[PDB]
């Protein structure tokens, strides 16, 4: 049943690994919380490559919403709308190719919402041609597009994160305008997923579209003949969470004909998960719908097997680390960090990475050409660079208390020769993922 | 003979009208893009767009992974030393990933892998380890869509000296170079991966007096004959002190080409005319055999043809270019000093507007205004109002409209509907807050809008 869930990860840690392993969500959305720390990102991809098949997605639309530094920044849908739609296709093929190479297999784009920066324009036809090119391009590049937000989010000024918005359009107006690019895309039979809008359409129905059996079954499934994968926008968003209970959102969305529940926080997965299981057991959710949902998800999952996973990098970092035997009991103490003064950016990043793994009492930035001034603490991490320049530098390093000092030889691994009888870790790299992996090793296999 | 540009590979630390002039005048076959361009994405994209329109080029970077990383698009790698500690397959996978990304951006060569022995950028001391990881690297880059360029022949590892500072020396005998430093090079040459070879600006006294780059013994007797490499051979950058403080330009050119070299690498496109003219002189006074220049041109053309690619990230530049709209502008106002009114901070885009404007206009001041308030009144010889949400209320819109209509240009960079609220005003619409779009709006302003 984890298959009816798509979880956003704003961090990656033992809690995230636990949730994923216990509930087996089928979908993974990676937030800037992870992407902005490249070591976390890479290690997350490696983890996912080892724990089954996932749909792996981002919100990298281009233009206004950009979260992947790996994709060149793009003017956005509004500028694209002004231009020959082939260009939109080329942009999405480029973007998709890059994403796919990293390990992504889905993107939550294009936006088909009409303009009344993230929109292709006012003209429904323009939005149709650019949205089709975008879905095709993304797909050609190696990523499944997800069009959003059905039936059209464009005619409200209000934001679904803040309140439940309202679009007053008649159904005939939605059909003629807001729904037209969605319709052209389904009629052209380009492979896509669909995301729903947390928006109320009062001239049509009471429920937000995410929760509306009329909007999802009668309009999307039957009138629009879309039989593919349907996702909620993130359920925790206030448009839903402040007007319906978790149980109500689960029931309505699934009864409405929805397939995957999008959570913006993986930690919320247990509540929602259990909620789903409960609603199935007391019969408030038709089992046939959950089964049809699971089948659709299994189709996409089988269809998405990527040959590419940038987590290979994490792997290299992991396997290039060497350690002497480490005393387990010292690892719970507070650490003083001795870090080469500012390859320099790598050094600047060491404290942040260390803080994930150990309590830190302070950070001392030493001059590599002098070596560390004398210091003491419960546990000392000396991040050794250029230890052998002369005897005075080397003895600056060797004077530290052998009993509670760990030498991380992060540049020239030959400096390791100069530390007999000492606790020594060799990383063969100054890069954050290598430091990260060296902490893992220290707490893990080295003790 | 209009093809002598094929014998040049030029580094670009900037992209500008001089760069287009040199490229169009000399037609160098090779383009190496430096951080001066790569760190300014609007520049990088506009350069790629320029390259797509001006013929076939070999386009390369120094993105090795590890210590030398210049492409933010490629995820960071621990580097060759860490890689050498691990199953070489992981090296092939990284280079395939990296190559796939590079090829998508529009690159078709990478100046990697380093096959120099360790005595961070090396796979290690053990020649066999270096050989297997180097082969994996070449195969990976190649699978990914980029032609590798192995370096630095015949091996740079056994010197403590740096070619940017002086001419280093490796004392190894040829029997030792053959057994060790050359083993990973030999491994690549015995495969069927297409590769280029870059020479080392290093002297091997037990073997020859000349830096390998300028050594007929090392490039013809060893590389062309003993090793049977018939592919593309490049110098390391000729301007480097190891060469330039010991040889004349004319000597560097003569020796390298007479040595069996094919492409001369310049680390500065602005050096292309001197070297270029030098080449021509040496060809006309017969100091360079025509047959060699011709074989060289043949080799470069074969490589060029091998690159038939569908990907160029310059399309982004193109989109940015075509989405710009402007009212007619008075050419005569454009040489004045500009006062910039920039939203206070998408936020990072606003921050970048001054840098971009400075390439195109003299800038007298930069004022950051509040979008919910609009600009305080100001005056200057030319005012650029970078308009965001002018329609919030009347007080904002009138903050914007108070500016002197005669010498204010309105850049409507978010909501293009604001354009309605500036009748009779000089107005430019970008449809984007992005640097490349702003860059293109300045170009259009100075170009087609006048």
Automatic annotation (TrEMBL), chain A:
Record has Hydrolase as a keyword: yes
Catalysed reactions listed for this entry: Hydrolysis of terminal non-reducing N-acetyl-D-hexosamine residues in N-acetyl-beta-D-hexosaminides
Domain Beta-N-acetylglucosaminidase C-terminal: 334-441
Pfam (any one): Glyco_hydro_3
E.C. number(s) listed in UniProt: 3.2.1.52
Keyword check for Lipid metabolism: no
Enzyme class: hydrolase
Residues given in the record as Zn(2+) 3 binding sites: 113, 149, 153
Binding locations of Zn(2+) 5: 159, 161
Domain spans labelled Glycoside hydrolase family 3 N-terminal: 2-295
Binding-site residues for Zn(2+) 1, renumbered to this chain: 50, 315, 318
Disulfide bonds: 323-446
Entries under SUPFAM superfamilies matching the protein: (Trans)glycosidases (SSF51445)
Chain positions recorded as Zn(2+) 2 binding sites: 82, 322, 428
Residue numbers binding Zn(2+) 6: 173, 177
Keywords: Glycosidase, Hydrolase, Metal-binding, Zinc
Residues that coordinate or bind Zn(2+) 8: 441
Residues reported to bind Zn(2+) 4: 149, 233
GO molecular function, one term: beta-N-acetylhexosaminidase activity
GO biological process, one term: peptidoglycan turnover
Residues the entry annotates as binding Zn(2+) 7: 291
Family: Belongs to the glycosyl hydrolase 3 family.
Protein name: beta-N-acetylhexosaminidase
Species this protein is from: Thermotoga neapolitana
Lineage start: Bacteria, Thermotogati, Thermotogota, Thermotogae, Thermotogales
